[PDB]
Assembly symmetry: C4
Homo-oligomer: 389 residues x 4
């Protein structure tokens, strides 16, 4: 085997509904299954297999450790995986490492797994290459060192990973790590709008450039948009100029007055957002998702734009279809690419959390839409789950 | 590995009882298992493995989502598989894609999986090659785009698949897709009796010809019998002329008066029907199955005829044996071929549904009969399942 | 890969306790597991893997299909397997074929699986090579066609299998089948004492000879002892002359008066009995087991004799150790050989049935003793199972 | 494949928290899982996989055989394994052999599994190579023949294994076995302080030397420290001279007066103790663990020393971090090494037993710390388990 590289995307002009992973369809009192209580799911693929990752609270439904599964960082939290298509239950899953923030990626030869844990004021990112623990990176703003919550991206054996550190309601200047066979070989300090950037959903815009659509949890409902040159290992960041604000909460589209850099209103709070690339011979499509509701983690819609500079185009994004209706949950979303024989298939997954407050369990299903065929996005996704069962 | 082709069938002159997959033997209140609630089971094999496919309601027994498992098309429905011989439970199964109509096939190199979902008036057939979503085909009569509910058939890397679209009580003109590495490369429009054809059970009658025995749900209890030339990609369809009507409901054998094309009576309603080929040096056997009851989905008998043209022979089909007695359920049946070292073993599977009305769960067992040895078919199959447990 | 042959056994002069497979340790009401209800367990090994076979009633503990699991031949009965060392539960097992009597063996290249089902008066032995159903053999005395209930034996790709047919309290003249790549290529009709022989535990005494220790259920408590020449495909059968009667029930050792052929008393009833070969350069050891009790299926002892002719030696068999004490069940026992890198390891397995009458469940554990090291057999085996749980 | 040898350790200067295997997070009355009741866990790795071993009581939680799971040696006890990262439940585990004391190791080509069972006064160590039972070694001081309770160590296909025999409150002179392809090829009788030595945690200090840190249960709270030359097959043993006594119970550090050989006080009782090597070009680090409490099996601290002779250095060991706080259980600990592509990753596992007295169940979680990155050990481990559930 040899190193993997981004290829031209597979033919198609529309996303369609692909697969639902709803493991809680199986966590009834009256049932006999043990789906793991998770959140922050995400898929990463290699040349032969696609793995469905998530952060588990080390509990199952039905269980007796529902208390604290609405929290985020504890000492029991773990990065787990199953082959995509398998229900992530206690026995099906494999536990990779302790983590309350995670990522993973295949480089053609082997899986890199990333997972941050540690105290809040001195957390610690850890890297595992296949079976071996290989490296770590230390907290630099001493306020909750975090990572992508989605797939990292490897080119010629170099995996690139966003990490961030800083306040949730103040400065969270992010960084990128360059990782080779599990070991950190460069710190890349981005330039530009670096005020606050977290949970980058990165993908290859081409062999030269990784682009990421991130979360600002303090200042704006515009997504910070990262452009990384993987040949000079240089990174720049500016807000997305589009009127189609992709964060949640957000104000009305086009209502943020001023040039492309204006913050301005409803910018505190946020949400991880889907983003994936469709690479064609002489054209690039940028697919995105955002909640159907402006203030709440309900529904998910798919948007798209072809070419241009996202840093300057105020043009509205083309609404492509309703993936999760306003009546269903749509929490985190993320991009990934399945590898066909000679081309890459761009997909967007959606974390569809089952939220009943802190007095019960708290987990998520996963909805997957992929680029397949021509025409219009046809069907929405439901979890099917009743949380009283 | 190289592409697969139909071979001469293994020696034998009789079917025998081979295997029972009854996963609800294990879904008792008192038990500790989770068989998946399914219907439309079907088996397809490649050179080293036979996979047992079904359409699941994304529910298990015992569970709490029995309501709606007597329906057919919903947003939770999925194509699932296990290795044939494994009980399809929550953890053993792999979920392939969202589907309320399905098919699958191996071409020598890889698995093609076919699944239709979407709204009733604009459904959408989707194709997955191994792990990648590769292609789609759109609704053309805007009334419930359907596929085979059984194995597709690949020759020299070209998989051929029946699709139909149309009213259940009127015109449902079918089509064939020719699929190569997961992508559609030709639409084949059949000629002749094309009034209504659905759920074709197709097999290779040879290296030149796919033949299918199908359902007409409107007009006749004679099966539409499709002959597809895979060298010119041309398809012709006519009713089976035999007095041994294979659909359900049906009238008395021989009682449909007139030439081979006469409809005539009890033609509305139907059932998917077993059919598999026994290819000998200079002789072809055609094995079929049909319910033991004339109006109900009870029992299943095996029939056979050697040579001739099914389009013209009114000759009764030879009753070969009672596979499932009149006292047991016999719903859908389908054909498939296991690959021995140097020859192909023709088999017929039987969907044996556990029907207790819409106020309880609704799933199926799977009975398998294969061509093995000489003599007379010896033993019938029972599910052993009591639905009250 | 190439065909397998018997080799010289591994160094050692004593059996020791190896492994217990007691799946019902896990079938409590208060538990969350589903061990399969079985009987007639047996192990067969190939060059990389040892498989643990059993006949299942298609039920689990805890379940609701306990009624009829004390019977033997029904329509739900199946041959199942797990990798030796795995608990045979619903999900771990693979179902091979419908069978109420079975056997299996590896030939170096692939698994042959044998299973008889069918009506009592016209049962049917079926053969499956890997995934394919390949051949069948018909009932010849129209009274319960049966097979070994243990591993068949393959040499240079020819697997040899005892089958019997006939009354349980009268004549049951056995036969041997010679099987190549799943197909029957010769019927071998044994000569000599052929009055009644069933459940042969066969092994290779060398490259030229298969020997079997069998059950007579009518006439004697001496084991019929089969010697098969695999070079001329000829079989001969005579009672075992030893005073150490291996059947159950049996009279006192040495109390059957007359020459080696005398029946005489307590001969009706019987039990399948362990037997395995230790092949050394210029010496052959014959290891056997028999119940600790003379009339009941309680306890199991290991016996041994080096060289001689079992057909003529009235010498007592050397008592080698107590494998299951008189307080624990010892039902069927069987021999098998694990393959080390350059030598074969002879083993004896013991079916330890959990019997509580027909008003509850009826299954078995499996105790394994193998040839390992020097000295005296050290420890006995218990199921650990309380049947009220 | 070829034989494996100790390599230079991977870069790093600190241990960090890696993974928690807490299978009882899933053994609630309210749940639907079956973790196995175990103790004496330990990990051993080969070139592609790390296996998590334990000694099971052949019972699960929840279940009905909690009585006797606080004992140690019974006839049901087994050596079991899962792939490290998998929860050891009934179905995930593989049962290797009956054992109430165990070890295992990869040699580059295959797994050796070691397991002692038998009566107290004539126990029996058994060896299995892959699938085959290959050899045994007999009790020599007729008082509980014991082995390491952790990974053996293979160099050039020779696996070396500590065994001990003797009273728990008197003389237990240990021995080493040298095992090749599952067969014993040399007995090594150590010299020096051989009064009492059990449960050696051995690793390669280099290509020439295995070193072990062991338990004296009678005489001292200093660990016996074994140095084995694998080129001349000679072993020597002396107390560790450090003031940082690693056993439990123990007195105050430095308070044992006299030279390096002084016993003296609180020496009865003991605990198996973590110990792993960090091999650098021209420097060796020795990492150890010991309970946070002086008398109780509570907490676990990581210690380290670079170079010197542990037989003579009274220097205090460097306290490196708190792995399990005083509030959590810290029973047995052990060392092991994961294999990265070109270097070995030293790790220390911690048995974190759930002890509620003999009137309830008794099993353990497993905490893993590995050498990864630079800086200070950052986070402690908790089981998360409430034993009332
Ligand atoms: C750390 C700040 C960040 C934004 C508030 O918290 C995230 C919000 C979450 C959320 O908004 O869904 C869930 C994440 N588990 C959480 N992250 C971590 C690493 O704990
Ligand atoms: C669309 C009508 C058609 C036959 C009239 O429905 C089928 C009948 C069924 C049946 O005849 O058993 C069950 C099938 N699950 C169903 N098909 C779909 C695709 O939903
Ligand atoms: C045909 C009778 C014969 C001996 C009495 O049968 C065996 C007896 C049995 C027994 O004595 O345990 C159990 C076996 N399952 C049984 N075989 C069948 C095929 O039913
Ligand atoms: C035999 C003496 C030894 C030290 C007292 O006992 C050990 C005590 C234990 C303990 O002290 O944790 C657990 C061990 N499972 C047990 N050993 C065996 C091999 O059965
Ligand atoms: C990227 O580079 C590799 C060669 O290194 C090439 O095979 C691949 O086609 C290129 N990808 C794109 C998207 O051009
Ligand atoms: C079909 O063609 C292939 C060669 O392409 C051949 O190997 C096979 O035997 C043929 N099958 C039949 C049924 O004639
Ligand atoms: C049996 O024959 C084969 C060669 O065909 C040989 O390799 C093997 O050692 C022989 N077995 C015995 C037990 O002599
Ligand atoms: C040990 O020896 C082998 C060669 O046999 C070598 O490859 C390896 O690097 C050596 N290990 C150390 C720690 O020096
Ligand atoms: Ca925001
Ligand atoms: Ca009809
Ligand atoms: Ca008898
Ligand atoms: Ca001590
Ligand atoms: Y399970």
């Amino acid at each position: 085997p040899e190193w993997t590289y981004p290829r031209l995307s597979c033919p198609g002009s529309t996303f369609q509904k692909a697969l639902l992973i709803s493991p809680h369809r199986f966590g009834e009192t009256k049932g006999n299954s043990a789906p793991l209580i998770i959140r922050e799911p995400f898929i990463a693929c290699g040349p032969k297999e696609c793995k469905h990752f998530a952060l588990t609270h080390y509990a199952a439904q039905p269980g007796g450790y529902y208390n604290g599964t609405r929290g985020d960082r504890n000492k029991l939290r773990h990065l787990i995986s199953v082959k995509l298509g398998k229900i992530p239950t206690v026995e099906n899953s494999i536990f990779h490492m302790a983590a309350w923030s995670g990522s993973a990626c295949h480089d053609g030869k082997e899986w890199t797994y990333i997972g941050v844990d540690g105290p809040e004021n001195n957390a610690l990112l850890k890297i595992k290459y296949g079976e071996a623990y290989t490296d770590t990176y230390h907290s630099y703003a001493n306020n909750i060192l975090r990572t992508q919550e989605s797939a990292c991206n490897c080119i010629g054996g170099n995996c690139y990973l966003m990490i961030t550190d800083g306040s949730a309601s103040g400065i969270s200047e992010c960084r990128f790590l360059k990782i080779r066979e599990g070991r950190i070989i460069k710190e890349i300090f981005p330039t530009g709008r670096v005020k606050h950037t977290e949970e980058c959903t990165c993908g290859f815009a081409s062999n030269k450039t990784i682009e990421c659509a991130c979360r600002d949890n303090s200042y704006t409902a515009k997504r910070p948009f990262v452009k990384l040159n993987v040949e000079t290992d240089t990174a720049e960041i500016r807000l997305m100029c589009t009127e189609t604000y992709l964060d949640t909460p957000r104000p009305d589209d086009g209502s943020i007055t001023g040039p492309c850099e204006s913050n301005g209103d409803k910018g505190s709070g946020g949400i991880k957002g889907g983003f994936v690339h469709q690479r064609m011979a002489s054209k690039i499509g940028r697919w995105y998702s955002r909640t159907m509701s402006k203030t709440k983690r309900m529904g998910m819609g798919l948007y798209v734009k072809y070419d241009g500079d996202p840093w300057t185009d105020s043009d509205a994004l083309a609404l492509s279809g309703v993936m999760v209706s306003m009546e269903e949950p749509g929490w985190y979303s993320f991009g990934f690419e399945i590898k066909d024989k000679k081309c890459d298939v761009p997909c967007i997954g959606i974390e569809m959390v089952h939220d009943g407050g802190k007095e019960t369990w708290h987990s998520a299903a996963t909805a997957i839409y992929c680029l397949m065929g021509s025409g219009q996005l046809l069907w929405d996704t439901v979890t099917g789950v009743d949380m009283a069962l």
